[PDB]
From a paper:
Hsp90 is essential in all eukaryotes where it regulates the form and function of diverse client proteins, many of which are key signal transducers. Hsp90 enables drug resistance via multiple molecular mechanisms, most notably through the stabilization of the stress-activated protein phosphatase calcineurin and multiple components of Pkc1 mitogen-activated protein kinase (MAPK) cell wall integrity pathway. Hsp90 also serves as the previously enigmatic thermal sensor that controls temperature-dependent morphogenetic switching in C. albicans, a key factor contributing to the organism’s virulence. To identify potentially exploitable differences in the Hsp90 expressed by a fungal pathogen vs humans, we determined the crystal structure of the C. albicans Hsp90 N-terminal domain, which includes the nucleotide-binding pocket targeted by all Hsp90 inhibitors in clinical development.
Seeking to reconcile apparent structural conservation with disparity in ATPase activity, we probed the conformational flexibility of the C. albicans NBD by solving structures of the domain in complex with two clinically relevant Hsp90 inhibitors, SNX-2112 and AUY922. These compounds were chosen because previously reported human Hsp90 structures had shown distinct conformational changes in the region defined by Hsp90 residues 104–111 in co-crystals with these ligands. In our FP assay, SNX-2112 showed threefold higher affinity for the fungal than human Hsp90-binding domain. However, in the fungal NBD, the dihydroindazolone moiety of SNX-2112 induced a localized structural rearrangement of the Val93–Ser102 (103–112 in human Hsp90) region distinct from the one observed in the human complex structure. An overlay between C. albicans NBD apo and SNX-2112 structures further demonstrates the significance of the structural rearrangement within the Val93–Ser102 region upon binding to SNX-2112, as this region shows the largest differences between both structures. The plasticity of the C. albicans Hsp90 ATP-binding site appears to be an important element in understanding differences in binding affinity for ortho-benzamide-type Hsp90 inhibitors like SNX-2112, due to the highly localized nature of the structural differences between the liganded C. albicans and human chaperones, and between the C. albicans liganded and apo structures. Nonetheless, there are significant variations in the structural repertoire available to the fungal and host chaperones. Both proteins can accommodate compounds such as SNX-2112 with a limited remodeling of the binding site.
Numbering used by the authors: 6 to 218
Write the structure that this text describes.
């Protein structure tokens, strides 16, 4: 049940995004699907040389699950997944190398929407969410949960409370009260159709409806 501290660049970064009055917040969703697609690219690459890598979850998919009652939006994929080392280290130093670059770009006039070219698009989720849990399962490890309140610290804990993923990652975004449109099927459909034409993988949406009886 370990606590860790964000680097000063990432804490700076998270503070910008969570407090930004940036209007086009729907790009948060394009960015998380791009993280997902890359993770699926990666297991697909490995499974080419070692097809047993897919046995943990033979289906390759992205899945969006609005949880209206909890005001949480979940984003799941069957990509490579992340080990405990990956989560504790926030993927290491090379992955976040562009954080300062990106922040310098924003000072010069850049659109928050180019965050993904600096390799840190994950943190765009704080445009719409004030809290996040990241559940992940890598073939080389057990299942873990990373969690952040958008503060200086985050936690990583062995996963003994969530559905088994088999392989891959699920994000649960605790939506800011001004962003609940993104629990809506129509809104979610608008945004995926807009920004995700060239994602090679099926993008599934899970919508809960009452049976008129
Ligand atoms: C570790 C984090 C909790 C905090 C973090 O810092 C971070 C970042 C970073 F900013 F570093 F780029 N990116 N990022 C993230 C978030 C979802 C995923 C996915 N849905 O799989 C992901 N996939 C990578 C995993 C590694 C493989 O090489 C390729 C596929 C990465 C995270 C999640």
């Amino acid at each position: 049940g370990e606590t860790h501290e964000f680097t000063a660049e990432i804490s700076q970064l998270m503070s910008l995004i969570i407090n930004t009055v940036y209007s086009n917040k729907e790009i948060f969703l394009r960015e998380l699907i791009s993280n997902a697609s890359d993770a699926l690219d990666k297991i697909r690459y490995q499974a080419l040389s070692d097809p047993s890598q897919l046995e943990s979850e033979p289906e390759l998919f992205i899945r969006i699950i609005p949880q209206k009652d909890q005001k949480v939006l979940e984003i799941r994929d069957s990509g490579i997944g992340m080990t405990k080392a990956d989560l504790v280290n926030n993927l290491g130093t090379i992955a976040k190398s562009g954080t300062k670059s990106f922040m310098e770009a924003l000072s010069a006039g850049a659109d928050v929407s180019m965050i993904g070219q600096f390799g840190v698009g994950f943190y765009s989720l704080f445009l719409v969410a004030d809290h996040v849990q990241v559940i992940s399962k890598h073939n080389d490890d057990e299942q873990y949960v990373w969690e952040s309140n958008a503060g200086g610290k985050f936690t990583v804990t062995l996963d003994e409370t969530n559905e088994r993923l088999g392989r891959g990652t699920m994000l649960r975004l605790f939506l800011k009260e001004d962003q609940l449109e993104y629990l809506e099927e129509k809104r979610i459909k608008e945004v995926v159709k807009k920004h995700s034409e060239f994602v090679a993988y099926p993008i599934q949406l899970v919508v809960t409806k009452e049976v008129e009886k």
